[PDB]
Amino acid sequence: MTTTMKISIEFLEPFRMTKWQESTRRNKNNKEFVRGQAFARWHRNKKDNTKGRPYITGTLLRSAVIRSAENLLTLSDGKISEKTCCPGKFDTEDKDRLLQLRQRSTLRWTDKNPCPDNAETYCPFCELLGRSFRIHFGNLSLPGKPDFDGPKAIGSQRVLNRVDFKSGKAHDFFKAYEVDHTRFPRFEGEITIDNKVSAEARKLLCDSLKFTDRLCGALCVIRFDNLAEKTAEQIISILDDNKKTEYTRLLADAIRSLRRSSKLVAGLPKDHDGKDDHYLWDIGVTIRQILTTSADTKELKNAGKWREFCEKLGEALYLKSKSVLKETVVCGELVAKTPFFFGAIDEDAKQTDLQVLLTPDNKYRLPRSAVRGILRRDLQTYFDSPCNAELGGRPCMCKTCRIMRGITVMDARSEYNAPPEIRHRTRINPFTGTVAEGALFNMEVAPEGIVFPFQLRYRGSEDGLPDALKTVLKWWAEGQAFMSGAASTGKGRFRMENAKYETLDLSDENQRNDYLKNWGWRDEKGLEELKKRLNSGLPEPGNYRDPKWHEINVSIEMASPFINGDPIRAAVDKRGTDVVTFVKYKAEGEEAKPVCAYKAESFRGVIRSAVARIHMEDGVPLTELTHSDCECLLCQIFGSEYEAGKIRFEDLVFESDPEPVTFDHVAIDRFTGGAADKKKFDDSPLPGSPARPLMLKGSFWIRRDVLEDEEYCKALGKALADVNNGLYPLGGKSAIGYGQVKSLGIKGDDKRISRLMNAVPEKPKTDAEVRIEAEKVYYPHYFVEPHKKVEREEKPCGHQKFHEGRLTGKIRCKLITKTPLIVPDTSNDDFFRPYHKSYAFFRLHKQIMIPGSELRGMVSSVYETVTNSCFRIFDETKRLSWRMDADQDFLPGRVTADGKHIQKFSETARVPPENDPDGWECKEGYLHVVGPSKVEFSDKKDWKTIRTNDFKNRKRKNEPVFCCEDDKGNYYTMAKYCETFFFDLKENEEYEIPEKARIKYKELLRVYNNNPQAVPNVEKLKSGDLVYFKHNEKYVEDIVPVRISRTVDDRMIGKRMSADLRPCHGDWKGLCPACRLFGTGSYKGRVRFGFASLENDPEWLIPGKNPGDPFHGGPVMLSLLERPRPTWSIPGSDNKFKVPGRKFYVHHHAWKTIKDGNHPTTGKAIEQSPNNRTVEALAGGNSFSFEIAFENLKEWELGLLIHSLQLEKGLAHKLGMAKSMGFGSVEIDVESVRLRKDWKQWRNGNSEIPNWLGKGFAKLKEWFRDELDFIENLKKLLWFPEGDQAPRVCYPMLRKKDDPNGNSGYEELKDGEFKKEDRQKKLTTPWTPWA
RNA sequence: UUGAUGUCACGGAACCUUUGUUGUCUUCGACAUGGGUA
Ligand SMILES: [Zn+2]
Ligand SMILES: [Zn+2]
Ligand SMILES: [Zn+2]
Ligand SMILES: [Zn+2]
């Protein structure tokens, strides 16, 4: 009587439940509840908080039971047992309580007489239906009833959308909660079956329960049985108290990238100087110390919790920065061939805009909804029949919907659990060539090689398997399965492997019984013993159809270095470099292997920009167009915001195993001629040379509609031909000569796109002459004094198109060396020495060659001198300071800065009472703490009268200061002898506090502390005879600790310029021609210099130790190379002393004396020192060749560029090291000039060089009427000495007392011809002697 | 913590849109310090 037996439900897939509702909101018309009727429900224990439990209703289990009962009733020949059944009751009285209505067609098994509601006996269908409260279905709450904090703690929200077949754009979306099946695997319940309706009813209920395949949205088997907040606050407080408050976003991104492993925290790089003073990590305790104490924590010894801690701290830092049925089964494995991206938005992570989909077990998940949608899309593609199936109403009667009704799949998850890698994407402005502001967004992807299981089942009134499904599976097995997102970026191309299939008839009694007992072979052991008997074959479709996407193979050759930027890998690196190469990881099992690649987004951007440049729509460029709601060619090919593109670009990977190389660069000041402070920057590009070219191979997928379109193929061929002919560079820093395209070859187009990819004058004679005398000595540099008028009235043109009336092409050049040339390779400073720095000549891939940055600097300097323009590099962060001589104004004082209205108190006078009865009055005075800076530095080998006690007074009773031995770092700390201390009331007057004398005093202590000359303390203003002040009106001027010492200026160096000679500010004032040609920080340059290669055997100054190899020279020892001293160029504090101009060196042959170990000035000897160089040089008469690529250059601009390269017959250039010793005199010869009339033809241009020179000279005389004296000054400075003419050029010596020649030294030149009031006129005249 | 004559929700791809790019010759000459007379 009412015997009850327990039941269990085990879920094999992640099931879903709907959002919880209150009893007032438990209605019929609510859309979310009527949608979630198919899923489980949630229950709240108490309404104050979210504590509750889930449960499943009994009506859903009832519906599954009658569905299975109908299936076995229509499968067992319509009849059951030995008595006639019924079709079933179908009647509803009240329409105001219908929660759900049956909109599905009832399966018809017979047209016999239905049994009535009241008869002698009841059929099994009647008692299962309920026509006989007899059968009760219980609830499925939980096994043992564990309590839970909330719904969010047991599952996760997810959003699913609906797409359109024609456009590919989603138009609607909904969301649902999903929980993991491994967290809640098991649900118990009770059921009351029958009392007196015999055994066939319970048997029918038994195989109806056994036939129940799915429930609650998933396939199931029914059986009858810390410190993150504290660390973030500490880091925030330390960054706030210390300086460098910026770069917090980069630090947070670096910390997020650090979550991969715990061992990288001990491998952070240091500063460029080698000390542990990194700008991003050694700021302070240090940030590195904080992360080190966080690393060696017993709590954070594991991996997943360390990852979660790093994610929380990174999020905190980002928030701070703000015969009938025939069941057919198919199984296989989906393998990734590209990195994929399944979208899943989480509100808890606001740092990355797009987030990949993961399980709470940190494993990658492939949902079944995407598989079902892609199957529907491929079916609609094969049949070419869009369907208008609405969400509700009558079921749709299309062929695709009938094929889909019967398709079941199985969710998959992998074993790879490493965190994803972040990818950044940036826009580029077309009118400028730089990245536009506010275009930063990151997004991560799963790596390639992740393998998923795959299962599929079919149930339909058909003998075998549909031909459309067979064709779709053949397409997937070919390797054209595109299911995940970002397809235009080239993401998510899977290939199905190990296809197995078998059909099972569902009308034979034995096979049906095998189905019921074996439970459909849907469990794990069921799959395990089904796979062995599963057939390994695969059928072939009859009406086969070709796929809609075609693969095109691309090969690119690069005879140049290449780099793709990555700031995050630069921040978390092993070495100190500003820029590194982009590197991506691929997964195989659990390990991830890194490879250098070229980003598909970069290639897509380059190709899109090329097509937009070469195609014009009614005069308006495609770059300038908004590309919104327009039918242009670029939107039709590459897609837009409202449609998907018909072309997909894949990632490109390099061949062989290249290794990165290190190149170092520095900026050169225009005036001083030395390297500007804090301007040394490094670079780590991939190596490339014409001898060993780089092979960039890859592919891209194109649609058949574009392939059959003749005009689209023609435009693509035009763009690919323009890319092939060296016009569009790939990568970054192309101005140095990086990433030039030599050759480009495509395959797989059937010769339909690739078929479109198929006398010099002489230099003018010079006219400037220089008189050279055979007994005079000249200064080894001069200034040109450029003109005070510059042009900024020209508006630059953009890079968005090729403007008419301008020239684009290449220039081949030559270079011959007249003096020895030194181009150093600074990677290794210990070549010759087995410490003294050594250096070596530059060599890329074991080939002697010259980088393009040095040549760019030479041509930029000469072009900047010829065309009047700003100083492109100037150290405006320096203040001058000169020493005054003995000569009345600086009155002594002893006062702080508190207030006003003071008197003439305190005592100060010279002392070394017993001499006079009234004198040496000592009442006020305490222990003195003073700055020890009152002894000379005569050298020529403790403070409080211990180490020194001698005087000079011996015979003449005068001058008692004795010449002491200052060579042990002594007698500066030991000071204050004959102190001007006290004993006369004649000092200490008024003082007020300015904002100018104070910073001048701290800069005076900066000069005193950082003195690199007298080293063989205090940074505050204190008393102790340190208030020697002069005053004007009420305020005061600068103060000094010693009555005769160094004084500092108050005018900065940048105010020594002209009104318009200051560097260009931009941010629109206008641009100078040099900034207009070579570019600024917010403007791309229009020239591209290339690397210069050698032709023949290099001749060296000294042969090497091994005569077999002619590629190695011999060492030569250079002399002392010390810093420039602007204090001689600008003599004093006067307003009339300004800057002379830009510095140029002179041509001479002093290296002949330097070869045989002689100084240029003394001629005695050269000794080993820790402060010189021992390099090797290329001899005179060496040929180099290079190429300059230009775009949209004007005629006069090209003429002046040609003039700046060629010069005249008698001039030369300066290159390399030791320009003061006459090293590196080169001349540039123009060999060939090519132009670009059209994309298909490239013409001559060896002619029209005199025409361009004439237009350039016309522009020069347009700018300046007759004041072209700097041109003759340039020609005089660049004039090369002729034969039988060897002038002597050397720097003056420190003193005359050691000169065999007897020439005047610096101290004699100070009073004489190089007087203070005429030094700026005697230095601004080329070849002016001083001897 | 479902209520007994009617549940195709395995009826719905988080899909499409965006070059980490621009600018810089691994270069080179004049000093450092305070007294000492009337
Ligand atoms: Zn019946
Ligand atoms: Zn349809
Ligand atoms: Zn458009
Ligand atoms: Zn400028």
XYZ file of N, CA, C and O and ligand atoms in Angstrom, chain A residues 627 630 632 635, ligand 3:
17
model
N 33.106 55.766 -42.593
C 32.855 54.341 -42.854
C 31.674 53.809 -42.045
O 31.693 52.680 -41.552
N 27.764 53.105 -45.113
C 28.225 53.395 -46.462
C 28.587 52.097 -47.168
O 28.917 51.089 -46.536
N 31.106 51.595 -49.409
C 32.418 51.751 -50.016
C 33.103 50.394 -50.182
O 32.654 49.366 -49.666
N 34.629 49.032 -46.765
C 33.596 48.432 -45.928
C 33.069 47.135 -46.526
O 32.671 46.230 -45.785
Zn 33.000 52.453 -45.708
